[PDB]
Design a protein around this ligand. Structure first.
Ligand SMILES: CC(=O)N[C@@H]1[C@@H](O[C@@H]2OC(C(=O)O)=C[C@H](O)[C@H]2O)[C@@H](OS(=O)(=O)O)[C@@H](COS(=O)(=O)O)O[C@H]1O
Ligand SMILES: CC(=O)N[C@@H]1[C@@H](O[C@@H]2OC(C(=O)O)=C[C@H](O)[C@H]2O)[C@@H](OS(=O)(=O)O)[C@@H](COS(=O)(=O)O)O[C@H]1O
Ligand SMILES: [Mg+2]
Length: 966
């Protein structure tokens, strides 16, 4: 504390704190005859002493401090967000008081003399009080008096006060509690309860105790963001450093506990050097509760009985210090927002210490406290299934904590009702199709957070949701088969679209830091072993592949011999992210588009700044293994040249998102994505349309981009490519990868190229092989550039410069000022000898494929290697074709004529929804030439032709096998 006024307009953000760690510490305080002020070193919040106030009822003391109270607007301007000036302090009662402490603000006040507030004194332990001086008093600039009046209707009494503070605080975070009413309240949990109730029986109680034990087992024998410490020397050393001691008639003294978010009320950047030094002595709750958990785990594993007892005493003392510090029911502590980050491992520690807390008579206090602070999560913790219940962050950061809270309930019947209700909650959250863009699983196996398919959030949710189902398995509390089935679909999908990292197009805002299925591995074991007919051989076979375990290892793990899954082969459509996956041998190709319902990219203030082209009709090829080891290197990466994309090559200042904070650019129409045929063949249809008026986006940049994928190959075609500037800098990237000693060779037309730097220009009938063994045959292009070159780029978080050496090739569309086009073919198993053979078949009147149509209405690709035809109806149309005559909606149709049958698939990749509305099915009428008889696809012969009726739900393809009528 200084001689300056509070909120000194001179230095508004500098908190004025009465902590008494300074010379003449009571200088600014006066008392009436019926009050006595002493320092005590018995307990304190900041510095080693607190104000002991002995009083008779109605007696006052006065703090004399000039307050220049800012408006909410002036506070907000000073800090840069919605702010209010706050008055706060800590008080300790050694015994409860039945009445109210009155705090009054005014000028030159005395016992007998503007505005003020009340604090109920019915409690023991530390409590914090924090009120907005502008919004929470029942204030003219001349305030110099803060009068603390003991309650009238109570004969005498005593109170410890510390850390009386004037600060600028976040306007969201002065919360009401059992001591103070503010303008803000986080209402208490009100648990839902499902009927019928399960009875208290030995069988149901035993199942509850086995669920608790199974949780203990998971935490005592590696969690992300759990700073595990197993060295007991280290736990004892950290614990002693808390300087906790039990006091005579109750409570503790030890270092003050504060959450990472509670520190805001101090404005610590702006603290005077004296206050900062004391503040720096606080303990961050996150660290403290992590320590409680590590001690609990060590306790559970400890074989030495002396050490074991010591670890229990350490845990219970930490528990007593935490409760006495005011982390108790009815104590807001001004705020506890983002409570999970500070407390998640406290919840889990209570499972391990449940019997110790029972014996110490602390279980009801710890349960009431955790329940109270959990009210921040009321939307999930109440356990009433809603459109928001499928929250993927919940499944990651809160679901096991939620279970642990319920198991901590002291009454047996209520504990069984809560865990029964939880099982129903989790089942519904894992079963329902949330409307619109809300979080959760989807029927194609995509899994959404931030209103789209998001592996970076779904992968940790899959791990923990699988664990939850496994914890409850084979009990009266087991998750419904419908939730198991949905989660299996999403997790088998993740195995398909990862190799073992998700591709660049699925990286969300973390390009070059893709999530890996390796982090989810244990979830496959958990979900396999929780099957109704356990083990689920598909999920077990994936667990062994991903975890690098052999068939010989399977018997001990699963109780029967299972062969590790081979990599999935064929084509899989995922219109939930307007993508598809083509798999052949050890390669995965991620084909990705975007549309009204699928954002192109997530770009934040410091994430994915150059990610504009993440979903521009990309076709990233990934062999099984590290993507970095295959040359997907962020340093020097040209963000313009995403593999398969058609882009405008821009300087990075122009490619950067035009929004300083968040942009999630959605497309201009519902239709773009993929479809599949026989689980083997795929097609992408991408209508590249830019916004009419977004800064840095050329409103006239357009392209129609189709890909047909079958076996070892993909046919890429593009048409109707345009820009505002005659296709200047408009380019289609064949590939880009870093040059390393392992990635040193390109082939061009049978010649080995290793020089750096190197440039050449190729054209129709030329071919290349990149260092990852992908071959590219140029089948239509005037100008293909190939470059081995030093590149300068910038990293996606802070735009700081990077550099690296890269091999790349791209089509230059500037040679066709209007409606530029391309065709090329990729071989996934290319060798110079096989590419010589494919080039020869291309020169033989194109024995590889034929484009039957390539315009703004339809792209039709006949693959002559596979004998499959792909039809990208960008618009409804009548066509001239052997098989297809007409389609009445934008759609993707595919055909395969085999021996005695014609197989037809159809879909729209349009999800037919908004951010708000549920997807509904689209009816697609596909007329085919000839008379056919036979899948849920309906057909009707109609003259010399056959009407097929497809139902496209969430872009999930349907197919039918037809055979000719005579
Ligand atoms: C603040 C911001 O830039 N984005 C908001 C999200 O926050 C980020 O995402 C998450 C997360 O999803 O866990 C945590 C961090 O705050 C940020 O990286 C997020 O807000 S959240 O309440 O913090 O989670 C979302 C809201 O959820 S959502 O649309 O799935 O409903 O809003 C983002 O904009
Ligand atoms: C999409 C996203 O940001 N997800 C969050 C995680 O970050 C990804 O994973 C990790 C990582 O934790 O190694 C690092 C990068 O930030 C992302 O690639 C991660 O956020 S965190 O900022 O890394 O802590 C997790 C945190 O989960 S936790 O709450 O289990 O610790 O939240 C993600 O899902
Ligand atoms: Mg003090």
């Amino acid at each position: 504390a200084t001689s300056n006024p509070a909120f000194d307009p001179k230095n508004l953000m500098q908190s004025e704190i009465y902590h008494f760690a300074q010379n003449n510490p009571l200088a600014d305080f006066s008392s009436d005859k019926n009050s006595i002020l002493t320092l005590s070193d018995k307990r304190s919040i900041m510095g080693n002493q607190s104000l002991l106030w002995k009083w008779k009822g109605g007696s006052s003391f006065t703090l004399h401090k000039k307050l220049i109270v800012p408006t909410d607007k002036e506070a907000s301007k000073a800090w840069g967000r919605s702010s209010t000036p706050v008055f706060s302090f800590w008080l300790y009662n050694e015994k409860p008081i039945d009445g109210y402490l009155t705090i009054d603000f005014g000028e030159k006040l005395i016992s007998t003399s503007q505005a003020g507030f009340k604090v109920k004194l019915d409690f023991t332990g530390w409590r914090a009080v924090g009120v907005s001086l502008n919004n929470d008093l029942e204030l003219g600039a001349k305030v110099d008096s803060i009068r603390f009046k003991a309650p009238s209707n109570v004969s005498q009494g005593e109170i410890y006060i510390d850390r009386i503070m004037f600060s600028v605080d976040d306007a969201r975070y002065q919360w009401s509690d059992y001591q103070v009413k503010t303008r803000l309240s986080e209402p208490e949990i009100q648990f839902h309860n499902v009927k019928p109730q399960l009875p208290v029986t030995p069988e149901n109680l035993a199942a509850i105790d086995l669920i608790r034990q199974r949780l203990i087992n998971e935490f005592v024998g590696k969690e992300t963001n759990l700073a595990l410490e197993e060295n007991i020397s280290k736990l004892k050393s950290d614990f002693d450093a808390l300087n906790i001691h039990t006091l005579a008639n109750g409570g503790t003294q030890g270092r003050h506990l504060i959450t990472d978010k509670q520190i805001i009320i101090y404005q610590p950047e702006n603290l005077n050097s004296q206050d900062k030094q004391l503040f720096d002595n606080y303990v961050i709750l996150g660290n403290y509760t992590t320590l409680m958990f590590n001690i609990s785990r060590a306790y559970v594993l400890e074989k030495d009985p002396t050490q074991k007892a010591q670890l229990k005493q350490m845990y219970l003392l930490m528990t007593k210090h935490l409760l006495d510090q005011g982390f108790v029911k009815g104590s807001a502590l001004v705020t506890t927002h983002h409570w999970g980050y500070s407390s998640r491992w406290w919840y889990i520690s209570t499972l391990l210490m449940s019997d110790a807390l029972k014996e110490a008579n602390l279980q009801t206090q710890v349960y009431d406290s955790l329940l109270w602070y959990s009210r921040e999560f009321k939307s999930s913790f109440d356990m009433k299934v809603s459109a928001d219940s499928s929250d993927l962050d919940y499944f990651n950061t809160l679901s096991r904590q939620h279970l642990a809270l319920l198991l901590l309930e002291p009454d047996d019947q209520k504990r069984i009702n809560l865990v029964n209700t939880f099982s129903h909650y989790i089942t519904g959250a894992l079963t329902q199709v949330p409307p619109g863009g809300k979080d959760g699983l989807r029927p194609d196996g995509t899994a959404w957070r931030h209103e789209g398919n998001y592996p970076g959030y779904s992968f940790p949710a899959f791990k923990n949701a699988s664990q939850l189902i496994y914890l409850l398995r084979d009990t009266p509390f087991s998750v419904g088969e419908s939730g198991w089935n949905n989660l299996k679909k999403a997790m088998v999908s993740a195995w398909i679209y990862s190799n073992p990292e998700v591709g660049l197009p699925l990286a969300g805002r973390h390009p070059f830091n893709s999530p890996s299925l390796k982090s989810v591995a244990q979830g496959y074991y958990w979900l396999a072993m929780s099957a109704k007919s356990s083990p689920d051989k598909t999920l077990a076979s994936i667990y062994l592949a991903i975890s690098d375990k052999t068939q010989n290892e399977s018997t001990a793990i699963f109780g029967e011999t299972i062969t590790p899954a081979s990599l999935p082969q064929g084509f899989y459509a995922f219109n939930g992210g307007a993508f598809g996956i083509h798999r052949w041998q050890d390669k995965m190709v991620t084909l990705k588009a975007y549309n009204t319902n699928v954002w192109s990219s997530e770009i934040y203030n410091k994430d994915n700044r150059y990610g504009r082209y993440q979903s521009h009709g990309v076709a990233q090829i990934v062999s099984n293994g590290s993507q970095l080891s295959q040359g997907y290197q962020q340093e020097g990466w040209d963000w313009n040249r995403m593999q398969g994309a058609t882009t405008i090559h821009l300087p990075l200042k122009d490619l950067d998102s035009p929004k300083p904070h968040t942009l999630m650019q959605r497309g201009e129409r519902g239709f773009s994505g993929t479809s599949s045929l026989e689980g083997q063949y795929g097609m992408m249809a991408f209508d590249l349309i830019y916004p009419a008026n977004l800064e840095r986006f050329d409103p006239n940049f357009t392209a129609k981009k189709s890909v047909l994928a079958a076996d070892n190959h993909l046919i890429f075609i593009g048409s109707n490519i345009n820009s505002s500037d005659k296709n200047k800098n408009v380019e289609t990237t064949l590939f880009q990868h870093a040059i390393t000693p392992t990635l040193n060779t390109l082939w061009i037309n049978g010649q080995k190229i290793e020089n750096m730097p190197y440039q050449t220009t190729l054209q129709q009938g030329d071919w290349l092989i990149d260092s990852n063994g992908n071959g590219y045959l140029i089948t239509q292009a005037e100008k293909v550039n190939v470059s081995r070159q030093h590149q300068v780029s910038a990293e996606n978080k802070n735009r700081q410069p990077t550099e690296g050496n890269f091999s790349s090739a791209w089509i230059d569309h500037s040679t066709r000022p209007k409606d530029a086009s391309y065709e090329y073919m990729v071989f996934l198993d290319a060798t110079p000898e096989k590419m010589g053979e494919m080039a020869q078949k291309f020169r033989e009147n194109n024995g590889l494929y034929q484009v039957l149509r390539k315009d703004k209405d339809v792209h039709i690709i006949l693959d002559k290697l596979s004998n499959v035809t792909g039809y990208a109806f960008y618009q409804p149309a009548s066509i001239e074709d052997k098989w297809i005559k007409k389609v009445n909606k934008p759609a993707i149709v595919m055909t395969h004529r085999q021996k005695d049958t014609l197989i037809v698939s159809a879909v729209t990749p349009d999800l037919n929804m908004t951010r708000q509305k549920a997807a509904t099915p689209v009816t697609i009428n596909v007329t085919i030439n000839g008379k056919w008889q036979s899948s849920e696809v309906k057909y009707q012969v109609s003259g010399d032709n056959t009407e097929l009726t497809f139902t496209s739900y969430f872009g999930i393809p349907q197919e039918i096998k037809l055979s000719p009528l005579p």
